[PDB]
Design an enzyme around this catalytic site. Structure first.
Site, PDB file in Angstrom:
ATOM      1  N   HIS A  24       0.797  -1.213   0.000  1.00 48.67           N
ATOM      2  CA  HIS A  24       0.000   0.000   0.000  1.00 48.67           C
ATOM      3  C   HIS A  24       0.834   1.270   0.000  1.00 48.67           C
ATOM      4  O   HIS A  24       0.298   2.341  -0.303  1.00 48.67           O
ATOM      5  CB  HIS A  24      -0.929   0.034   1.215  1.00 48.67           C
TER       6      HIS A  24
HETATM    7 ZN   LIG Z   1      -4.201  -6.192   3.024  1.00 49.81          ZN
END
Ligand SMILES: [Zn+2]
Ligand SMILES: [Zn+2]
Ligand SMILES: [Zn+2]
Ligand SMILES: [Zn+2]
Ligand SMILES: [Zn+2]
Lengths: 322, 48, 341, 80, 117, 77, 384, 183
Positions: free
Chosen positions: G151
């Site tokens: 992320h």
């Molecule tokens: Zn995740």
């Protein structure tokens, strides 16, 4: 018609409008003359060339070629500045997470302290086997020669005082000869006391896990009783058959000229299950008190007679099987 | 100036006529330009 | 408190242990210190009943681990809200004034590391000290500023009065907003219009029962194929069916949602969607005409539909020309009144 | 805690209305809630002290009117 | 330069993260409802809020204290009795100072003269 | 509804019976008694009996009132 | 007519697909903790590793401790200012960096713990050394559970991820491989990795994620890449409670079509444990067999792969599934009876390897997944 | 009470600007390919020859110069949203880097001039200005506004920043968003 919408999007809109009408949407598909890029997507927007020019010192030509720096996305942009919906978890799942949290707390603290004990005892067994004339100027580098430079700092800052942890770290760096054995002894005492508390807590955690875990893994079963009370009613059972009939009548005018003479289909491959339900019903009749005994026995032969008459089961088979 | 954002009051039959007119225009201009390019290519192959 | 007891020559002798009991009993996540174990009050409901081998192979790793540095890049390669925007955040507080401003909201904006050393006054406060320090009254300085700035006369009174005004975030005036009735103003002053949902309160998101969630994915809910005000079945537009399910085969039930504009019910599979669009913008079914399209020039051209205007300033006009009238794409459909057929 | 504001402003008006009071200041309610709690901790301190005297771990209406008896006030129909 | 923090958030976007009708005069209805709450006999504090009050306020004296159902009802009644007497005394000390509206200072004097301050 | 609910149990009865009967517990949990002590004292596990027949007996006991709802659900789960 | 409902076949290894497995573990990774109330725990790495050692899996593989990344090796993807902030921020001097806290999204949902820089260095070094060992041919499978931070982006920290080590590993793979396929079976969308390689055709980023109002919000099916990276970012949106058979019948056709169409030279597999059933933040219903079937299926293609472990917020389940996946890469199936480790008390009540799925509704209908895979297959026709 | 007759096309342009800044989180391309001076100079050079009155010419030049001075002195105060104040800060620091003071005439585009026009009546009502000056300033602003309709397709165009680099608005970064609306 105003030379605004393109033919591709017009065909897409008519496809969304007359998709199930295959004959009509083909008339149009061709009455029109459609023959079978820049699809950016909804969750990316393009930065200007001013925002791209930010120094990344480690990038070579290949890194500048294969990495995207103009198109970006963010959770706030994809949320439309509203937020996100977390998945709902049972209270048993929440207390399982709390048990895991406490477990992680104890194990993280104990293993960090144990790693610091291993490093400090390496330093101690190094410093024991040398004389005192060079033990005065013996120093220790940051990290104490370990691959981390912060783990021993965390352990010292926790075990000792907040303001005194920094000065103990500096005293260990400058004069490890006196500070190393006392720090190692205090860390070992804290280790054994934390481990005894962790075992006593481990008993409690294990018993709650045994109490909680299978209910936590049950999702539909935790709410099945209220769901069965709400949905196994007359209204929902009428709604199911009426919805299937409405679907059949709606799709009858489009195709399938031999309209089916049934809505619901039930399969009964096993016959012993009828005897099992009859035994359960008989058990409820014997147990209950709100029904009179003549009403009880009439319920009994009504259930037996309906099962023997509706299906292929005989009354003799029912009597010999129950 | 309220006259700039005037909403056109149009009817269904006019939309039908306009859609039919513009699809017939588009179809035959592409057909006639294809015919003209075919004739031009035939003349080019004859002259060559 | 004399940690290192040095000798007369500076040599170390012996150190004293500091206060371990200062934070030996800090409350951990368990609610009890790590020094002690669980209490009986929590042991009552945790344990089932309460009455009143070392063959580890995990120590061999350090030895079996070989370092790895074979990469090609080895070595080297006062108020609680801002007085300008009416929003919360980190503020620079006026000393002789109860107003607080964001660090970026001032003119010029103040760096959060290069702060003013002694005192900071706002623009209104600074104008107040400038007026009180000067012996002449406000209209005398206004007339002097008008007469000295003889190049511009009409804007001179406008130029004078905004030095006293504190900096504020620009907001559109009401008469620019009232001409478009669909356009609303958010809680932070942000834009909002008809393509925006009513924000769901926390009573709906997190204060709901386990089985029933706003997501409508954790349970079988057949009270979504049934219209509330009519009692009929919400027939999906594409498949022309309502897959209500049967509660004995709940996997046969297809999820259905309604459009937020024309209330046309759509299955979650007929239009490819995995979410139910619970919060954010209003979900638009595929049948609605777009308010913004891009077409290829063969650059490009864009067209945006005109915003809705209130009835006092919106003129609906009927063309005289029926065929080929170049409308901007902004039209209205009137009812059609045997010869025409 | 959360239930001290649970003694609501109309309820305080209803007590005042039962008490024949026509007009009530806005600052009555919170310090009236305070007067209520000082009275409650006093009475329940006496009642609970009676309760752990009895080798008990529930308080009873009998113990309440008993604490009230010590405090001086008596209640009827709640035992005693 | 004095500064303060109000966002109380180290980072923004925390949500997007993974962790013709009649009107009686002002005063007219009140006497109609003096009589309603006086001819009535119910207990004027809602039982669930008051029950929760007694639970939340008794917990500090002794852990895990249970209350008989009738015990909190004796409390409910005793408290209403206590307050209606104090409010009659209030109305009396308020009508003393050429007034109809009461103010807290009325009832701190009412408690002070009764000898519990 | 009852027959479908029982048919889901009976159609998988042989595999769940073979899974419960061939439940080889790990050794260090037996030496350090980490397993659940109960669900065997009250006879709630399905070891030694057919799974579907034990479901029928447990449901009969639940109907008769001698078995709690929570223990029946825990045994089934 | 693309999706086929197929029951979950048992996991079987291929004896003709023996791979040299490199394991990257730094004993320090676990001694780092995001916070007191935080779901992400690096402690899951070493209980996963303790299951590797106690299963005797170290005799079939080589354990390496990767050199931690320096500042400017991290800057192969991230900016200088973000790495400079990450290497200097501590919980002590958090007030000294308030502008950078909201600039780089560090302080809330990505807290500042005092071993942040060292944790990121361990993760990035593990990923880059696994890619480097894959480049030189020293190993066929590189296992690094220290990373998985998919992320993290160029100048921000999101989703409990600070240093996007997967981008660094794919960068190191691209120096020797022309086409690198990234597969993300994490329940969240691999927004950082997909955003990094959005405009390039050299990296195909495939993500099998839940797409609702779920983090990070990105991952619509129409997100297929722009520029030269068009149709080179496959997004597979899934609903809640997908089971092993459904996930297998979605995963295997898509990855197979990518294999015979994109034809990659290296594979990066994000093994997020939050795709498992019973996760704190995940909403899927995968058992450990269902999670490991993706790793076993991608192992069958013979492409030199980098198995990198990502999410997973219940430590026991992610540790068990990582141990099973690691054992699967050595062409063995570990028995469902856990050996004695120092963290044996986590895996109650049965103390077995298996992660049991929940009985929750598989709301991913066959029609929806058929449409999803039909559009995905149609977009993949241009990747030859 | 002071009223301004802004055309609804320019009102919709301002509302779209509000949409782009607050909802879509878009800032303006600065400096624009067409600035504010550039618009107040072309309008003066267009309507200067429209009539042959020298007093009207003096009044027009007076209005243009006063609008320029007002724009420069008021842009930092009250003419830009909270999102664009970070861009204002970086412009001020960039101007201070090269030791030239920042003038908003040559930097900001015509949309901020339209913002100043739209917020102008409230500023008029907040100063001790006599009725004649208010009426004539409102009249001159109205004439400039109806001049803007004849050139609304060349100053206020509609372009997606994701497709065209020559759009009037640009998409923002997450770091800009955090610094602008997080502290
Ligand atoms: Zn995740
Ligand atoms: Zn001030
Ligand atoms: Zn502000
Ligand atoms: Zn449908
Ligand atoms: Zn609709």
């Amino acid at each position: 018609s105003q030379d605004i919408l393109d033919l591709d999007d017009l065909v897409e809109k008519v496809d969304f409008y007359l998709g199930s009408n295959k004959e009509l949407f083909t008339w149009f598909k061709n009455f029109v003359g459609y023959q079978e890029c820049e699809a950016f997507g909804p969750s990316y927007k393009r930065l200007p060339k001013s925002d791209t020019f930010m120094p990344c010192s480690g990038r070579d030509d290949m890194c500048w070629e294969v990495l995207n720096d103009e198109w970006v996305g963010h959770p706030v942009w994809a949320s439309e500045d509203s937020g996100f919906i977390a998945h709902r978890k049972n209270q048993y799942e929440e207390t399982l997470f709390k048990i895991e949290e406490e477990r992680h707390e104890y194990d993280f603290y104990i293993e960090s302290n144990l790693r610091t004990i291993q490093c400090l005892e390496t330093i101690v067994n190094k410093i024991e086997n040398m004389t005192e004339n060079e033990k005065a100027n013996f120093k220790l580098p940051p990290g104490l020669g370990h691959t981390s430079m912060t783990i021993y700092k965390k352990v010292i800052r926790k075990v000792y005082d907040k303001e005194r942890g920094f000065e103990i770290i500096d005293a260990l760096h400058e004069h490890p000869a006196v500070t190393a054995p006392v720090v190692l002894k205090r860390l070992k005492q804290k280790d054994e006391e934390w481990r005894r508390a962790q075992r006593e807590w481990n008993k409690v955690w294990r018993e709650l896990e045994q109490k909680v875990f299978f209910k936590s893994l049950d999702h539909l079963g935790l709410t099945f009783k209220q769901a069965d009370k709400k949905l196994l009613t007359t209204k929902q059972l009428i709604s199911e058959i009426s919805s299937i009939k409405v679907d059949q009548t709606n799709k009858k005018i489009h195709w399938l000229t031999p309209k089916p003479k049934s809505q619901l289909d039930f399969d009964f491959p096993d016959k012993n299950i009828f005897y099992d339900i009859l035994c359960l019903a008989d058990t409820f009749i014997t147990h209950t008190t709100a029904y009179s005994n003549p009403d009880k026995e009439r319920l009994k032969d009504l259930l037996k007679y309906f099962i023997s008459l509706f299906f292929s089961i005989s009354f003799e088979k029912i009597e010999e099987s129950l | 100036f309220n006259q700039d954002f005037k909403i056109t009051q149009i009817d269904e039959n006019s939309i039908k006529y306009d859609f039919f007119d513009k699809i017939y225009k588009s179809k035959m201009v592409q057909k006639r330009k294809l015919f003209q390019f075919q004739e031009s290519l035939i003349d080019k192959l004859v002259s060559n | 408190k004399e940690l290192l007891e040095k000798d007369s020559k500076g040599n170390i002798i012996k150190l004293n242990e500091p206060s371990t009991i200062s934070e030996d009993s800090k409350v951990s996540v368990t609610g009890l210190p790590l020094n002690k174990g669980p209490s009986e009050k929590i042991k009552r409901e945790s344990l089932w009943n309460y009455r009143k081998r070392n063959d580890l192979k995990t120590f061999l790793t350090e030895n079996m681990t070989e370092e790895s540095n074979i990469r090609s890049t080895i070595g080297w390669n006062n108020e609680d809200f801002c007085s300008a925007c009416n929003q919360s955040g980190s503020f620079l507080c006026c000393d002789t004034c109860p107003k607080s401003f964001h660090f970026l909201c001032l003119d010029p904006p103040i760096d959060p590391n290069n702060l003013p050393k002694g005192d900071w006054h706002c623009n209104e406060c600074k104008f107040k000290i400038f007026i009180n320090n000067s012996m002449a009254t406000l209209k005398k300085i206004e007339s002097n500023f008008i007469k000295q700035n003889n190049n511009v006369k009409i804007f001179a009174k406008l130029l004078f009065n905004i030095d006293s005004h504190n900096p504020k975030q620009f907001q559109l005036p009401n008469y620019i907003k009232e001409t478009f009735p669909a356009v609303k103003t958010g809680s932070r002053g942000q834009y909002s219009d008809e393509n925006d949902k009513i924000p769901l309160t926390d009573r709906q998101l997190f204060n709901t029962s386990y089985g029933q969630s706003i997501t409508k994915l954790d349970s079988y809910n057949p009270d979504t194929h049934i219209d509330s005000n009519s009692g009929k079945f919400l027939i999906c537009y594409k498949c022309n069916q309502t897959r209500l399910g049967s509660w004995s085969h709940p996997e046969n039930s297809r999820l259905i949602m309604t459009c937020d504009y024309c209330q046309t019910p759509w299955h979650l599979d007929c239009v490819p969607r995995a979410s139910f669009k619970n919060l954010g913008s209003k979900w638009k079914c595929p049948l609605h005409s777009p308010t913004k399209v891009y077409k290829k020039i063969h650059n490009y051209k864009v067209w945006k539909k005109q915003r809705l205007i209130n009835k006092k300033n919106q003129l609906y006009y009927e063309p005289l020309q029926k065929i080929g009238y170049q409308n901007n794409g902004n039209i209205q459909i009137i009812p059609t009144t045997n010869s025409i057929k | 805690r959360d239930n001290i504001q649970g003694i609501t402003k109309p309820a305080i008006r209803r007590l005042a209305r039962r008490g024949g009071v026509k007009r009530i200041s806005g600052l009555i309610y919170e310090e009236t809630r305070g007067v209520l709690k000082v009275f409650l901790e006093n009475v329940i301190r006496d009642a609970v002290t009676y309760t752990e005297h009895a080798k008990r771990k529930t308080v009873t209406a009998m113990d309440v009117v008993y604490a009230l008896k010590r405090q001086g006030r008596t209640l009827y129909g709640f035992g005693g | 330069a004095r500064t303060k923090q109000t966002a109380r958030k180290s980072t923004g976007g925390k949500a997007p993260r993974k962790q013709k009708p009649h009107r009686y005069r002002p005063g007219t209805v009140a006497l109609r409802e003096i009589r309603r709450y006086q001819k009535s006999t119910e207990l004027l504090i809602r039982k669930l809020p008051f029950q929760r009050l007694v639970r939340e306020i008794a917990q500090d004296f002794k852990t895990d204290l249970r209350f008989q159902s009738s015990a909190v009802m004796a409390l409910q009644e005793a408290s209403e009795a206590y307050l209606v007497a104090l409010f009659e005394d209030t109305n009396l000390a308020a009508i003393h100072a050429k007034r109809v509206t009461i103010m807290p200072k009325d009832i701190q004097l009412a408690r002070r003269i009764r000898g519990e301050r | 509804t009852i027959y479908e609910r029982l048919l889901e149990i009976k159609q998988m009865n042989e595999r769940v019976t073979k899974e419960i009967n061939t439940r080889s517990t790990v050794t260090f949990a037996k030496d350090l008694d980490l397993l659940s002590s109960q669900l065997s004292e009250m006879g709630l596990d399905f070891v030694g009996e057919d799974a579907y027949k034990q479901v029928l007996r447990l449901s009969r006991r639940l109907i008769n009132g001698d078995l709690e709802h929570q223990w029946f659900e825990e045994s089934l789960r | 007519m693309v999706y086929e409902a197929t029951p979950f076949d048992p996991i079987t290894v291929k004896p003709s697909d023996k791979r040299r497995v490199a394991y990257f573990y730094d004993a320090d990774v676990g001694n780092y903790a995001y916070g007191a109330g935080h779901p992400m725990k690096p402690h899951r790495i070493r209980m996963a590793h303790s299951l590797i050692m106690n299963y005797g899996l170290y005799k079939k593989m080589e354990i390496y401790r990767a050199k931690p990344a320096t500042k400017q090796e991290m800057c192969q993807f991230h900016t200088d200012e973000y790495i400079d902030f990450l290497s200097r921020v501590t919980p002590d001097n958090l007030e000294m960096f308030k502008r950078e806290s909201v600039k780089f999204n560090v302080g809330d949902d990505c807290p500042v713990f005092d071993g942040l820089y060292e944790y990121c260095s361990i993760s990035g070094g593990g990923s880059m050394e696994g890619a480097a060992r894959l480049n030189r041919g020293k190993c066929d499978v590189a296992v690094n559970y220290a990373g998985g931070l998919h992320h993290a982006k160029k100048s921000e920290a999101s989703g409990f991820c600070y240093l996007n080590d997967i981008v660094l590993g794919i960068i190191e793979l691209l120096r020797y491989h022309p086409r690198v396929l990234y597969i993300d079976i994490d329940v969240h969308h691999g927004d950082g990795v997909e955003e990094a390689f959005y405009t390039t055709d050299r990296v195909m980023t495939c993500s099998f994620h839940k797409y609702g109002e779920f983090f990070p919000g990105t991952g619509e099916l129409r997100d297929i890449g722009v520029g030269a990276g068009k149709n080179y970012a496959v997004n597979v949106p899934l609903r809640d409670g997908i089971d092993d058979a459904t996930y297998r019948s979605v995963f295997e056709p898509v990855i197979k079509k990518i294999m015979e169409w994109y034809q990659p030279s290296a594979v990066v597999l994000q093994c997020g444990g939050d795709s498992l059933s019973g996760d704190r933040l995940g909403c899927f219903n995968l058992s450990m067999e269902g999670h490991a079937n993706c790793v076993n299926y991608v192992k069958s293609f013979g492409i030199p792969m980098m198995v990198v472990g990502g999410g997973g917020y219940t430590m026991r389940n992610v540790a068990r599934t990582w141990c099973f996946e690691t054992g699967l890469l050595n062409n063995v199936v570990l028995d469902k009876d856990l050996p004695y480790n120092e963290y044996y008390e986590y895996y109650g009540p049965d103390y077995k390897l298996s992660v049991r799925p929940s009985n929750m509704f598989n709301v991913n209908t066959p029609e929806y997944l058929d449409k999803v895979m039909t559009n995905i297959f149609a977009n993949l026709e241009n990747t030859k | 009470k002071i009223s301004l007759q802004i055309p609804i096309k320019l009102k919709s342009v301002l509302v779209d600007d509000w949409e782009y800044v607050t909802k879509d989180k878009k800032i303006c391309r600065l400096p624009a390919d067409v600035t504010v001076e550039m618009v107040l100079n072309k309008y003066e050079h267009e309507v200067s020859q429209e009539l042959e009155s020298p007093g009207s010419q003096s009044q027009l030049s007076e209005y243009c110069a006063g609008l320029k001075l007002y724009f420069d002195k008021c842009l930092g105060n009250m003419l830009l949203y909270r999102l664009e104040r970070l861009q204002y800060d970086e412009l001020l620091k960039k101007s201070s880097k090269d030791q030239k003071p920042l003038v908003p005439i040559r930097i900001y585009g015509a949309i901020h001039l339209l913002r100043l026009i739209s917020v102008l009546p409230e500023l008029i009502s907040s100063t001790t200005m006599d009725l004649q000056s208010c009426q004539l300033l409102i009249k001159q602003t109205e004439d400039f506004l109806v001049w803007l309709l004849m050139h609304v397709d060349e100053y206020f165009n509609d372009k997606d920043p994701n497709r065209s680099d020559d759009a009037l608005y640009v998409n923002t970064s997450s770091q800009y968003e955090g610094v602008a609306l997080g502290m």
